[PDB]
Structure formats: structure tokens, C-alpha cells
Amino acid sequence: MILDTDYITEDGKPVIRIFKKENGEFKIEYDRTFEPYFYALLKDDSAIEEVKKITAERHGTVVTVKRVEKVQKKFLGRPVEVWKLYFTHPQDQPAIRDKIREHPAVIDIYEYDTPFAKRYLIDKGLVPMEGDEELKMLAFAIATLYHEGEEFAEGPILMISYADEEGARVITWKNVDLPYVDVVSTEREMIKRFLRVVKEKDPDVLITYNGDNFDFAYLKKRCEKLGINFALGRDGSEPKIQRMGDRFAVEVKGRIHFDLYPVIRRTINLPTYTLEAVYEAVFGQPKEKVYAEEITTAWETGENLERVARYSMEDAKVTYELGKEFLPMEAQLSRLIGQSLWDVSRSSTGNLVEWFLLRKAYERNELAPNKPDEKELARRRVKEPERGLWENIVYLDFRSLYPSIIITHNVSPDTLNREGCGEYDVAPQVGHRFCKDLPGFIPSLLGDLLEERQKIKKKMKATIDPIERKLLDYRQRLIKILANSVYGHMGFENARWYCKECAESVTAWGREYLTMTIKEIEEKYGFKVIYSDTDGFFATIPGADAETVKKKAMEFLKYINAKLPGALELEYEGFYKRGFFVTKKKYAVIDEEGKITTRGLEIVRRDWSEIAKETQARVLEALLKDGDVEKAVRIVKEVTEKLSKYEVPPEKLVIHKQITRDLKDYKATGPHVAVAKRLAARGVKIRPGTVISYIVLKGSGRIGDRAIPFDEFDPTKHRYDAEYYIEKQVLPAVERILRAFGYRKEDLRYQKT
Ligand SMILES: [Mg+2]
Ligand SMILES: [Mg+2]
Ligand SMILES: [Mg+2]
Ligand SMILES: [Mg+2]
Ligand SMILES: [Mg+2]
Ligand SMILES: [Mg+2]
Ligand SMILES: [Mg+2]
Ligand SMILES: [Mg+2]
Ligand SMILES: [Mg+2]
Ligand code: NA
Ligand code: NA
């Protein structure tokens, strides 16, 4: 299995290394035969002799064109003749490329800035992370001595924790008497011991959380300070930093440094990306945070070091588990995109699409178009649903609408307005013509992807190993997203295969096929379409029973799919006993077993009191389970009355809100801050991350001066602000739903007093 590739320089020539793990053993294969190159299109072939003599200087040495070769490749759908320019070293290209381009005889150059080791994987047809090999992983974390107003890593590393399948352990240089703690004399011995642990376990993957920007940088400075050869690379190298645009990344040669931070940042939306928040999100269970001042205070006083050690062990432990959780998906991605997990784990959707497409282009001998220049980048810059309760609803939607359009109409930059074609398809509204005589670059590669996905689904059934099936499932699911990412690519201003006409033709066709499908089902099968969005719609036959609606649905799908051209296909996605539709993106349905599914409506954040969430839930089931609007309305009115009668348990009024800044550097951004400041004033430790839990009390002033921490609420003396909970919690939770039935907030309570 291929893990990574790079190059070293040997007598001024590149030596590709391919890092592999085969039959449970690490191996480095060398290849000295591969040569840097890019392409030039010239006005007069004759000028090649001048172009061959162009030179530049890198460092203090002369850079020349090593050799040239006339080649034939596809550009804009047609065979073209271009000159392949070879160079001695990859770093020659940035030095000489602009001098070649600037030559008068040179029209343009192409494929001139692909990183050498990534070209290698492409041009040789190699794919990372392919095979049955099992990777050995090791997570690690550190805890440091922090003092505000100090330079970075001025203080020592206090603890290094690490976790793999054999458990988690902590290394530290003060005595902590715990079974999972290994005590050593000094920081230096700690670090050295950690090196021995890594070298002896020899993992293929090192997992961190934010190691790209903190852990390895800290370790680096401390190792400089202490004169330690931090030789974690399997070739004896030290971790190497790469500039990752705004910040940095770190490689450990011969291994994969999997930093979870960027992976998780893109996979899940959260307000905060602390390790504790991410571990609760993913695994559903809190993780306790020990703050930096407590760590430093513990080290200084010698007291509560066991608490520090446990936090350190847990950092490593949860980092490992998160790695176990996210890495297999990123590995399948890496295999499908054909680039290393190191690169893929840190790459935008954009970058990943381009790498896939560059490979396809190499595989089809198509000359890649160029990223736009800044002048070009500048150039590249409805229907409310039916109201009310519906019953016996079917959801029907297209299979891979945008890909399927692209395939069907052969939509591609290289097919657009092709001259002298005998057959073209014409985009609605926008009018762009796409030639059908020859399959386009994008349509052909998308057809292959959609096919492989169906082939993968076929094998998933023919398999029992649930693991193998999950890995097949990941690949299948990744292909679908890649297919849609290809569609987005055509509309993206920085894309190589940009094609604005392609993008706007695809969406135009989509609207035509959706709207036509809706027209047929209503006119020719008596359905009423309740709600539609882009690539699907809900409908019913008003007054029909569930079986009629299903049967007619299946008959319509047959009719429409026969009429639909090519790959366009509508499918039965589900049946729903009842539902309602507030607006685009906001709706609620219940299936025949009782399972409610909602979208755009449910009240989630912990900024909502339980009474709000509970009431909204009860409304939704009165609407969906009972089809009873008046009952939903009675529930609300009854809740708001109970509030006013001080009958709602105080535990259902509690609002929780996290402190984000120093209570000094705040925004007067709510009652949670006022409570925080009073606590601070009494001498309570408030930090970013402190959760404040409060109840709002009746009286005058902003809620702020009136709210109090839940643990101080005593019903025998305190009266909560029934009005606040009615008007600012309960009613806002239900108003959007019940507006869809003609009710305004004031219609859902008794009159104020
Ligand atoms: Mg750490
Ligand atoms: Mg080793
Ligand atoms: Mg770092
Ligand atoms: Mg090296
Ligand atoms: Mg990473
Ligand atoms: Mg895969
Ligand atoms: Mg690739
Ligand atoms: Mg579908
Ligand atoms: Mg309630
Ligand atoms: Na390939
Ligand atoms: Na024809």
C-alpha cells in the first residue's frame, strides 16, 4: 500500500521516494528515472530552437531547458501539437517558466506548477491507500507550562501523552502516582522517552489535534533548546513544516501525520472546536477540560497533578478514538482522489476536484487548461409550498440530477459551441449548444464514476464482512459527492475546467426537467404537488387512500422515466402519512410507522429552555400524529397559562450559555454575561468555556440585571418571569410552525395583564 511520495535531490537530480507498507513492513522504493516537465504551445515550430536556448538562474546556477519533444494531446476537444519541455530539477520550473512564457514565439505554457511528487503519482497511475494492509496508528498530545506574557514555548513541556490500541499513557518529570504514568527525571528525558516509544511502536500514522500548529512547533523549540535530535521520520529526519497558506502543516517522513483539526472543522459545524466540544459532538459524552492556569498552578504547588495527568491521558485517548473514527473515510477519499492522505486531509473540496480531474486528464491525454490569471478571475465574478396539512404524501426525486444532465446533454467546456458538429443539444433559456458527436471530457469521466458507484452497490449486497461493506459504502458515498463536486467545479471562478455556460445550462435544464415532471404528474395523473425544491417534490392525490397514491405513483414513475431522456431518472424516495410545509427548506413529515422527520424548524440550541423545546415537540406531534391544529393551539395556550400560574418546574426554565471572551472584553451580549460578572465579582473563576446556567426573574430592568444562576433559585422566595418565558421562549419556538396555519403569536396566549 502506498502511503506517501516525495523527492530528495541527489547530485542536483530528483530522486522520487515512494513510501510503502507491504506485508506488514515499511519499505522505501526509489525512482531516479522521472523527469520534471511542462508544455508550451508555439506560434512557429521553428522557434523551438530559440526557446530551447532560454535560460534562467536559480541560486547561483544556470537553469536550462534539458530537452524537448513534440507531442500530440487533446485541447478543447481537438488534437493539438504541443512541445514537452523537460528540466533537470523540479525547482527549475518556477525559475524559467516566466522567461519561456515571455518569449514572443510562445503562446502559452501549461501544467507548469504541479508539485513533482504529485505529478509522479498521476503519471505512473499509482494510487495511495490501496490494498488490504492495516495501518498502525498512534495518537499523542502534550501539556505545557504556560505563563501569560511569555514567548511561545518559553516554558517546558510538562507531560507527553500517547494512545494506541494497547491503552493510553502519560510521560512526565514530576511524580504522579497513577497506573498509566511513567515518571522520568527531566523534560529532556521525557521527550527522549517519547521518541523511544514512537520508534519502538513504529506507527504508520501519528494522530494529533492541532499538531500542525501547536504540538510539533512546541516540541521543535524545546528540542532546539535542549539539543535533541527529534528524529521522528522513518528515514531519521525531523518533522518538516509546510506553509499551508495562512498557517502551517507538518509532515513526518515515512509516516502520515493526520491532524484531526482540519478534517473535523470541515466535516462538522460547531461553535467551538476545542477537543472537548468535538469529542462530545462525535461520541455524545462530555470530556472535562483542565485549563492552562490550573495546569501551571498544579505544577507549581505540586497539588492536583493527578488531575493534570488524567486530562493528559484523556487528550491522547480521545484523539486516538477520533482518529479511529475519521481516518478510514479520509483514506477512502485519498484512494478515490489519487493523492496522499496527508494532502487530502488538509485540502479544500476545490483542490481535491482539480487533483481528480488532473489525473483523468492525464489518463485521457487531455492538456489541462490553466488556472485563471487575475484579469480572468475578475471576469468570472422560488415558489412557496402549499399551506395546510396534507396526507398520503410521496416524495419523488431525481437520481444525481446535475451529473445526469451533464452526461445526457454532453455538457463540457470542450463540447460548448463546437463548430461543424452534426448534432447538438440546446440549453433552455440560456441557449448554449453542446456538441453530441464526441463525448466530452466531463461527461465521460462522470459516466464512469456513476457506473462504478452502481458496481460498488452491487458488490455491497454480495458481501457479508460488514467491515468490507462499510469501506465499500464509504467509496460509493464519496463518488456521489465527487460527481456533484465536479458539477460545482464548472461554476467556480478559480477552477481549471471552469465553464460558466456549462454551469448555467445544467441548472436551466434542471429547472426544465423538474417543472415538466411536475406538470405531467398533475395533468396526467391527478396529483397535486405540494412542495418542490431543485431535484424533488412531495405530492399526493387529494382524497385518495395510501395504496392508491402508491400505485399511481409507481405508474407515473414508469411513464415519466420512459419519457425522460438518457440518464435522467425520477425515483420513489418515500411515503408519509402526513406533513406540512412552511416554506422553502422548512417542513415536517411523519411516516407510516410514526417516525417524524423535520427540516428547518426544530429548536436545537441550549439557548432554548426545556419548556420551549418540549412545547414545540408537542405541537409537532399534534399536527403530524393527530392532524389536529386546534389541539396544537390548545397546548400552547395551556403552557403559557401554566407559566403565568408559576406551575412550570424551574428546571424547565434553565438557559445555558457559554462564556466566549473575558467578561471585560465583552459585547454586553446578554444576561449570561451579567450573571457571569456578578459571579466573577464574588470571586468565582469565570473563563472562556465556563457555562452559565440561569433563570430569568420577574421585575424591571434588562433580563441581565434580573437573571440569576440556577443553583441559587429557590421557589419559596423567587418568582420566575412568566412573561419572558412566554414571549421570548415558548411563543417564538412555535410561531413559525403555527404561522403556516394562520396564527399569530398573540393568538396563542391569554391576554396580558
Ligand atoms: Mg496537545
Ligand atoms: Mg520507527
Ligand atoms: Mg505545530
Ligand atoms: Mg527526509
Ligand atoms: Mg490532517
Ligand atoms: Mg475509495
Ligand atoms: Mg490525482
Ligand atoms: Mg435520489
Ligand atoms: Mg410543553
Ligand atoms: Na490514474
Ligand atoms: Na445528424
Side-chain angles (χ1 to χ4, degrees), residues 96-319:
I96 193 168
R97 57 160 81 120
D98 283 357
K99 290 192 92 290
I100 291 170
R101 167 137 56 201
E102 284 164 17
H103 192 264
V106 166
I107 295 147
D108 228 315
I109 78 192
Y110 311 81
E111 309 198 21
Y112 53 83
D113 62 358
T114 296
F116 189 64
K118 299 196 228 296
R119 177 95 272 168
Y120 187 84
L121 280 161
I122 291 185
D123 295 18
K124 306 306 254 223
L126 307 165
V127 190
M129 317 297 310
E130 277 217 320
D132 68 311
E133 220 73 44
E134 295 290 7
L135 293 175
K136 196 159 145 73
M137 326 212 267
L138 184 66
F140 76 89
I142 72 190
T144 65
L145 185 77
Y146 173 80
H147 282 275
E148 100 185 65
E150 290 206 308
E151 280 200 335
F152 178 88
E154 172 141 61
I157 296 170
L158 310 181
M159 278 180 198
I160 305 178
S161 53
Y162 65 88
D164 61 14
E165 287 294 342
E166 296 191 313
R169 296 201 67 81
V170 181
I171 308 168
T172 188
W173 46 290
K174 275 191 179 191
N175 189 69
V176 182
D177 185 49
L178 289 164
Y180 54 80
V181 175
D182 297 320
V183 184
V184 307
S185 49
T186 76
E187 181 187 13
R188 179 169 227 271
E189 283 305 296
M190 185 178 49
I191 295 167
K192 275 175 56 172
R193 179 171 190 111
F194 174 59
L195 274 163
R196 199 181 313 107
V197 160
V198 172
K199 195 228 71 179
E200 142 197 335
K201 295 174 168 302
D202 190 18
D204 305 295
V205 186
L206 289 163
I207 305 149
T208 72
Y209 193 76
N210 203 27
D212 276 348
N213 293 277
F214 183 79
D215 308 42
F216 279 108
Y218 213 106
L219 275 163
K220 172 155 145 252
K221 210 159 253 182
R222 297 314 293 183
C223 278
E224 325 212 284
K225 211 223 172 104
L226 304 182
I228 290 188
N229 184 14
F230 199 43
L232 281 168
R234 275 165 158 168
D235 64 345
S237 47
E238 286 184 325
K240 169 143 155 233
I241 77 86
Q242 297 300 141
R243 64 313 308 270
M244 226 55 169
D246 36 358
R247 292 138 101 220
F248 308 83
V250 178
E251 332 174 53
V252 175
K253 315 244 72 174
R255 312 201 207 261
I256 303 150
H257 171 218
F258 190 64
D259 187 342
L260 285 155
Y261 185 74
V263 176
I264 274 146
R265 186 58 156 71
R266 67 163 73 87
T267 305
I268 59 194
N269 174 54
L270 308 179
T272 62
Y273 286 96
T274 66
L275 178 56
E276 292 77 33
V278 164
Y279 173 83
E280 219 179 347
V282 166
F283 288 102
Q285 308 251 346
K287 177 189 174 293
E288 176 187 22
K289 173 70 183 196
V290 179
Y291 290 89
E293 308 59 17
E294 319 182 82
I295 290 168
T296 289
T297 285
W299 192 261
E300 297 189 329
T301 62
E303 292 298 305
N304 305 328
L305 282 186
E306 301 196 328
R307 198 192 172 220
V308 180
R310 174 171 89 258
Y311 172 72
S312 185
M313 178 264 289
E314 284 182 0
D315 269 23
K317 209 179 157 58
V318 303
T319 294

Side-chain angles (χ1 to χ4, degrees), residues 557-565:
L557 282 171
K558 253 198 37 163
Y559 168 81
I560 204 81
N561 283 334
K563 170 184 308 220
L564 276 163

